[PDB]
Structures are given as structure tokens and as C-alpha cells.
Amino acid sequence: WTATSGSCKGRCFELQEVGPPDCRCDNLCKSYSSCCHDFDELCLKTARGWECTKDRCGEVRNEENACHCSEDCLSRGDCCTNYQVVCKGESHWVDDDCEEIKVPECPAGFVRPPLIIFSVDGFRASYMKKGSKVMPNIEKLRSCGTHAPYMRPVYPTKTFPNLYTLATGLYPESHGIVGNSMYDPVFDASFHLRGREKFNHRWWGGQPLWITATKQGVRAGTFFWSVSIPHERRILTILQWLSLPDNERPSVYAFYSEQPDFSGHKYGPFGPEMTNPLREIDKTVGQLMDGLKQLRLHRCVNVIFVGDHGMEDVTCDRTEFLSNYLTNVDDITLVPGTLGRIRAKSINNSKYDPKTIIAALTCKKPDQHFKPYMKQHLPKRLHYANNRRIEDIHLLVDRRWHVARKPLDVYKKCFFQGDHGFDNKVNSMQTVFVGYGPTFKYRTKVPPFENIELYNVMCDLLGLKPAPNNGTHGSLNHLLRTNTFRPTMPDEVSRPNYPGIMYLQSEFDLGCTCDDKVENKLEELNKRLHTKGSTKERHLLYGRPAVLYRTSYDILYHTDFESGYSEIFLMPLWTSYTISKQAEVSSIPEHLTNCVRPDVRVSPGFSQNCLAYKNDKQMSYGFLFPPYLSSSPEAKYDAFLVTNMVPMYPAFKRVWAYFQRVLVKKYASERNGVNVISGPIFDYNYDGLRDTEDEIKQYVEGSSIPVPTHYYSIITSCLDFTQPADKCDGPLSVSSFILPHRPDNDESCNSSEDESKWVEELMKMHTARVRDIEHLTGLDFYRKTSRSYSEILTLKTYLHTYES
């Protein structure tokens, strides 16, 4: 109950929320049924529209007008945005030449350049080129400022997840807004876009920019705009706030447009009806820039033009129905559409079985347009699991499709021709970034980056210390003229041991055999040299990874590879090797098929053993440095050391062997050599973070050998592929993956076929950033290169997406 019979006189769009049941005049007032009686009359004026005309110039102020063309309007801060153009012979901002903004050019009393975030819903990356002819203001921002070819959203590629990631620098799993609808079992409550539920603070985790700003003495405008406030009035409201006195004036502002998403849903991304919404957004940008120019702020304010997600072609007829797969279809609740999430109708149902639901959804139809996953099995690059609001069963829906429970759900609740929410690597989901202003670079292209990075930059732009987030601070320094954040490499926590030969063969009782007894003085000194690190400059190109937690580990050198061998996990944390373009692939000789060799540098008590793998009927083993890429028959013996062995499901060994036997050499040939770092990952609680050993849920039967949840590889080469990987003078090129270590290949529908037909496709789905691997391993890579640390941070954030 509000008492809506106070007044908004002189409080229109007040910045501090006065508290119920005083009546409100800020702009959530609408969403709470709490506006003062006179809010519309006083705060939402519309008379005479939004543009000065020649006849209004010098008018007598009339306070009923929506905006003013009277002589006193600039000092009152409420002219129509085109006032100077119409009434003072000025040029529209868009008609002026691009002029570099080397320093902020701010009115007196401005302590720092303001930041305006101009967010556009559903603005697909390719609109920048395809609509260029009708968006002159946006094209000027883009060509004059700093821009990327596109910006990668987070998954799911929906509005609230992406805008709140923008505001927090957090993955949806961490901020809590994991979809446009959710259930929180702990709260026992449901969240929807409609409804008033979404306004409860309990949903919204992390620390959004406006709170970061306010805690550190920087004032913010509103970020949420009521749907009934027209765009022209949101712009005027921002410009009015910008004429407040210095002690009252915000430094950060946001403007939000429901378009072009709104029309894209109706008309598809490139429907003829989409030209007009693009024109209208551009005109709104024009109003802001002309309003800034009137206030002498157009060379003072940093503007960020950013989208939340793109838009794909999606129709009613491209819908998969769970009722075509399950019989029990009425025992589930599906969160439907461009993703699926499944849980039980009743938690009083003890008969509900995830495993049978998954099996009933797996490769059941030959052209099936969705794939089921337990959420812990989703590609780690989605970071979509560590939240109670994300249901254990997930469906990744093919682009251009929907999933629904039953057909009646689609015609008792055709219309739409566009939608979004797919995998965030999908081209049609990519969105836009432009930064324009004194702090951004001039006429600069930057590579595509992820929207989780922007929070740190926005904090830099405003002199704020960012709250802890998923960005990599420094990775976007290259966007900025000044206000760079000069990151420093994290300190190594554990220093390695460098063991020599300390154990006689007979001290080992591992139940291993190798056929390796086959006796020179030239070749005697050589082997010694290799075991002491003589080839290490070839195989370890970017220094040793730093271990950023407390543990016990050994560096082991070999002719063909170097490893960091964990005494706690009984296997390498990392294995590093370089494969030149000219390298030869060989087979595992017949006599060496089951060969495993004790490592006389490492104690029996810190070694794996062969017996465990023999007794474990489900578990086999593989090798991190592949025997197939041995430099010589003699070097090959090194690859069979027990210190190179790792636990692997037979089904996973199909993947791993094909990667090691065929793909590494392919990459070396295409990229002119590669450096490979491979190792295990343990993420049993699916939080994206290295497990401690007391979190491991599975071991090789009857042993203390932990079973990895995933295997990674980082594959680096020279960006200038005329230079070999091992003699690269300039920037690097990387691709990485985090393959799930699964006992079946049920994820791959074509896995009964030869590996040449499915393995590479799996690996692409599980592409990863180096930084993803860093979080999962507590390692820090690229410690010793020629390159600046900011560049390396950019490289560590790169994702190879394999889109056309």
C-alpha cells in the first residue's frame, strides 16, 4: 500500500528512492504501482513532441512542453536535443568531421569524464555492416571510436543474463540470473520477466556497477527504464541529470532500447521490417550526441554502445517436442525454447530418474535438433553449472530451433520469426561493442572479446576498484588511450623439486613390465644432457607454468617433453612438448604395446602402478606426451615412463589417441609447428575451479590415483605462420580445449564410426580459453615470453570458436 497523493512537483526522476509509503517519482515507480498521482502529468510531458521547430525558437517558456526552445533552456538543462541546430545555426553531431579526442574537454566542475552505457537489445553484430546505410550516428561512433567486429555474450544468450553480466563482470552461474525464467528450490520461488517477482533483490547476486560506483563515492543514474517511458524522455532525463550541480550529478548513466530485439522476434533478424527499428535507434543516438554537444560534453563523455545478444531465424515449425521422445512426459517440467532445462514435476516422486530421461533423449532421431547433457558435462567454456537454479538436465538446442514439452505448448501459449538464447559461440548470437570518448582509442579496431570483460573497463573508466569478477583485468587495456590497469603476474606459490636418479629399478613393485633391455659413450653423455634439461628450450617455449597453490611437485626433463609431476595427484599437472612442421609420426612398436617403466627419479610411494589399472575393469590409461611423436626409437622409451601415464576410460582413449596420433601433426603442418601443453583437470563440484584432493569423488580402483573429470591441451604457435613455433619473434596464436573425461561417447551420435568423422567435432565443441584452464588447474601459463603482459592476458582470454 502506497499513499500516492503526495506530489512529484520538482522531484521528477529523483535519484534517491524515497521509501514507501511516501509516493515515488524515480522510474521504478511504475513497476511498483507507487507513482504519485501527478507523475504522468508532471514527469511524462509530451506536448509539442521532442523537436524544436523554427517557430518555437526564442519562445516564452511553457512548462507543459515536453522539451523547450526558449532562450533559458540550456541553463535549465531541458532544451529539445535539436535546439541549437534549429535555433542557433549549429550542426548535428553526426555532420561534424571526426576529430581525435586526445584529452577530456569537460566543463568546469567535471571531476572525471562521465560514462554513458547505451545498451541495445538484440543488436546482432552483423547489423553494423548490413544496416550501415541507415545508421549514420552509430557508424560515426564506430569508425571514429574503438570497436570490435563483434562481442561474445554469455550463455544463455538472453537479456537479463547478459545485461546483468555486463553490470557485474560475472558469469550467470555466479550472479544468479541464469535465465529469463528460474526456480530457486532453497527460496522455494519462481522468477519471470513479467511479474513483480524479478524485483526482489534475492535473485540478483554479485555487485553491479551502480553499487560499485555508489560505495566508492561515484553517483549513478538508473539502469532500469520503465517500458512506458519513451526513448526521447530517457535521453532528456539523462541530459537533465547531466546539468545537475557537481555534488548531485551522477558520473555513470545507462540508456536501454527494447529494440531491435522486439521487432526481430516478430520479423526475423533481417526481415524488411527491421530497417525502421535500426533507423530509430540511430536517431536516438543522434539525439544523445546532439544533446551532449549542446551541453559541451561531446568531447568529455565516454560512450559505450553495446548489445546483449543477437537474433537468429526461428519458426514455430522448427520445434522438437519432448513428447516425441519420452512417455513419462507429464512427470517433467521443461524450461523451454532456445535451451532446455528439465526437472521433476514433484520432489515427492522418488521414481523420477535423470538417467532414463537422458537416455531417452540421446541420439534418438537421425537429425535430432537438441542434445541432452547433465549440466556438469556441458562445455566448460559455457560456465553453466555452479548454481542451484540451473537444473541438472540441460538441453543444448541447435541454432534455428526450439524445444518444447508437447505440441499444445506451442499453439495454446504462427507468430514469431526470430529468437535467441543458443550457445554463445553461435555467429547469429554475437553482438556489438563500440567505445567512443577521450579514454577510448581513436579509429581503432580491436579483436572480438567477451562481455564479462567490460565491468573491469567500466570501473577503470570511472576510477573504481572492481569487485571480484570473471573478467581478466588488463585483457582489454588495448581498448584504452589512458586509465589502463597495469596488471602484474601472480606470484608462484610452490617451487618445483628437480629430482635426479634416486631409486634403483628393483625398489619398485608397480606390476608393470616393459620389454626395454637393449644396451655407447657418445649417446651416454647425450641422454644425461636430455634428463638435465638440454632440449628444454625447444619444448618449454614460454617458461614453466607457475603453480599458484601449495603443493609438492617435480620438474622432469626428457628429450621430447618436459613435465611438472605432482606427488599428491601421482601424475603430471602439465606436460609441454613442441612438434615442428617436419616432425614424423610413428607407431607404438608391437613389443612396447603394454610397456610401462618405473621413473628412477620418483619414489615408488609417489608413483602410479599397473596393478590398479589391471584390477580396475572400467579404467585404462593413456599418456600425456604421445609415444607416436617420439623423436627417435630410443627417445620413445621416455614416453612409457610411469610418470607420463594418466587414467583414461577406453571410450575416452579413442578421442585422446586420435588427437595425439592424427591431429597434433595436422596442426603442426598447418601452423608451422606447435607447442602443446596437456594435462588433467579435476572439477568434481563443477565450479570451474581446481579441486583440492579432498574433493575427488573417484579413484582408480584400489589406489590413491585420482580420476580426472577432464583433459586439456593448449596449442600455441606463431601468429606469423611463416615463422616456426620454436623460433617466433612476435605475437602468438593459440587454441585450447577441455575435453570431458567420459566413460562413453554418448555425446557424439556418430561415434560408432571412425574417429575421422566425429572426434574433431567433439573437440571443437569443447574449445576453451587458456584462462578457463588456469582456473581449473591453478596454473599460470606464458610466464616467459617476449610479449607485454597485457597482450598475453588478451591471448589467455582468446577462444577459438570454429564459426565461419
Ligand X SMILES: *[C@@H]1O[C@H](CO)[C@@H](O[C@@H]2O[C@H](CO)[C@@H](O[C@@H]3O[C@H](CO[C@H]4O[C@H](CO)[C@@H](O)[C@H](O[C@H]5O[C@H](CO)[C@@H](O)[C@H](O)[C@@H]5O[C@H]5O[C@H](CO)[C@@H](O)[C@H](O)[C@@H]5O)[C@@H]4O)[C@@H](O)[C@H](O[C@H]4O[C@H](CO)[C@@H](O)[C@H](O)[C@@H]4O[C@H]4O[C@H](CO)[C@@H](O)[C@H](O)[C@@H]4O)[C@@H]3O)[C@H](O)[C@H]2NC(C)=O)[C@H](O)[C@H]1NC(C)=O
Identify the active-site residue in 81, 146, 157, 159: 159
Does 780 help bind Zn ion (rule: CB under 5 A)?
A: no
d(CA 426, CA 429): 5
Question: How many residues contact ligand YO8, by CB under 6 A?
Answer: 17
Closest CA to 485 of 459, 504, 447: 459
Q: Which does 751 bind (CB under 5 to 8 A by kind): Na ion, Zn ion, Cl ion, none?
A: Na ion
CB of 223 to ligand YO8, least distance (A): 4
Query: Which of Zn ion, Ca ion, K ion, none binds 616 (CB below 5-8 Å, type-dependent)?
Result: K ion
Amino acid at 626: P
Q: Choose between 362 and 494: whose C-beta lies nearer to Na ion.
A: 362
* Residue least distant from Na ion (Cβ): 751
Q: How far apart are CA 201 and CA 179, in angstroms?
A: 16
Contact call for residues 372 and 366 (beta carbons, < 8 A): no
Which of 170, 288 has the CB closer to ligand X?
170
- Positions in the binding site for Cl ion (CB under 5 A): 117, 119, 179-180, 254, 256
Give the nearer residue to ligand YO8 in terms of CB position, either 48 or 473: 473
The distance of closest approach from Cβ of residue 462 to ligand X in the complex, given in angstroms and rounded to an integer, is 20
Q: Of 256 and 758, which has the nearer Cβ to ligand YO8? A: 256
Find the part of the chain contacting Ca ion (CB under 5 A) among 50-58, 124-132, 260-268, 750-758. 260-268
Q: Is residue 451 a contact point for ligand YO8 (CB under 6 A)?
A: no
Cis peptide before 572 (omega within 30 of 0): no
Among 232, 616, 691, 780, binds K ion (CB under 5 A): 616
Region binding ligand YO8 by CB under 6 A among candidate stretches 223-231, 408-416, 586-594, 747-755: 223-231
Task: State the Cα–Cα distance between residues 304 and 290, nearest whole angstrom.
Answer: 16
Q: Any alpha helices (H) in 354-498, and if so which ranges? A: 354-361, 408-411, 454-462
Query: Which amino acids are annotated as binding site, given as ranges?
Result: 121, 159, 180, 261, 265, 308-309, 420, 683, 685, 687, 689, 691
Site for ligand YO8 in 116-155 (CB under 6 A): 117, 119
613 binds, among ligand YO8, K ion, Na ion, none (CB under 5 to 8 A by kind): K ion
Residue 745 binding result from Ca ion, ligand YO8, Na ion, none, given CB thresholds of 5 to 8 Å by partner type:
Na ion
- Of 267, 613, 625, 782, which lies in the binding site for K ion, with binding defined by CB under 5 A? 613
Question: DSSP secondary-structure letter at 221?
Answer: -
How far is the C-alpha of 495 from the C-alpha of 111, rounded, in Å? 46
Is 211 among the residues that bind ligand X (CB under 6 A)?
no
Site residues (CB under 5 A) for Zn ion, limited to 236-265: 261
SS3 213: helix
Per CB under 5 A, does 121 bind Ca ion? yes
Smaller CB separation from Cl ion, 39 or 256:
256
Separation of alpha carbons 641 and 514, rounded Å: 10
Q: Closest by alpha carbon to 336, among 378, 262, 411, 394? A: 394
Q: Which of 185, 224, 489, 697 binds ligand YO8 (CB under 6 A)?
A: 224
Q: Whole-number minimum distance, CB 239 to Cl ion, in Å? A: 15
User: Is 199 one of the binding residues for ligand YO8 (CB under 6 A)?
Assistant: no
Q: Which does 470 bind (CB under 5 to 8 A by kind): Na ion, ligand X, Cl ion, none?
A: ligand X
486: left (phi over 0), alpha (psi -120 to 50) or beta: beta
Q: Is 387 in the site for ligand X (CB under 6 A)?
A: yes
- Residue 745 binds Na ion, judged by CB under 5 A: yes
Smallest Cα–Cα separation from 6: which of 23, 27, 28, 29? 23
From 801, 797, 728, 682, select the one nearest 169 (Cα to Cα): 797
* Contact partner at residue 487 from Zn ion, ligand X, Cl ion, none, CB < 5 to 8 Å by partner kind: none
Residue 222 or 735 with smaller CB distance to ligand YO8: 222
Determine the straight-line distance between the first and last CA of the chain, rounded to whole angstroms.
Answer: 56
CA distances in angstroms from 84 to 64, 70, 235, 280, 503, listed in the order given:
21, 11, 16, 21, 86
Q: State the CB neighbour count (10 A cutoff) for residue 248.
A: 10
Cβ(345)–Cβ(330) below 8 Å: yes
Q: How many helices (H) and strands (E) does the chain have?
A: 23, 29
- Residue 57: burial class (beta carbons within 10 Å; 0-12, 13-18, 19+): middle
Examine residue 257 and tell whether it contacts ligand YO8 (CB under 6 A): no
Q: Say how many CA atoms lie within 13 Å of 183 toward its Cβ.
A: 12
Helix (H) or strand (E) segment spanning residue 796: helix 789-797
Q: Are 288 and 301 in contact (CB under 8 A)?
A: no
The stretch among 23-31, 271-279, 482-490, 605-613 that binds K ion (CB under 5 A) is 605-613
Position among 439, 469, 575, 717 found at the interface with ligand X (CB under 6 A): 469
Question: Can you tell me the distance from the alpha carbon of 180 to that of 488, in angstroms, rounded to the nearest whole number?
Answer: 38
From the list 163, 220, 668, 677, which residue makes contact with ligand YO8 (rule: CB under 6 A)?
163
Mark 42-81 with x for binding to ligand X (rule: CB under 6 A) and - for no binding: ----------------------------------------
**CB nearer K ion, residue 497 or residue 620:** 620
Q: For residue 53, indicate whether it is catalytic.
A: no
Binding site for Na ion (CB under 5 A): 745, 748, 751
Residues serving a catalytic function are 159
Q: Interface with ligand X by CB under 6 A: which residues?
A: 170-171, 173-176, 205-206, 383, 386-387, 468-470, 688-689, 775
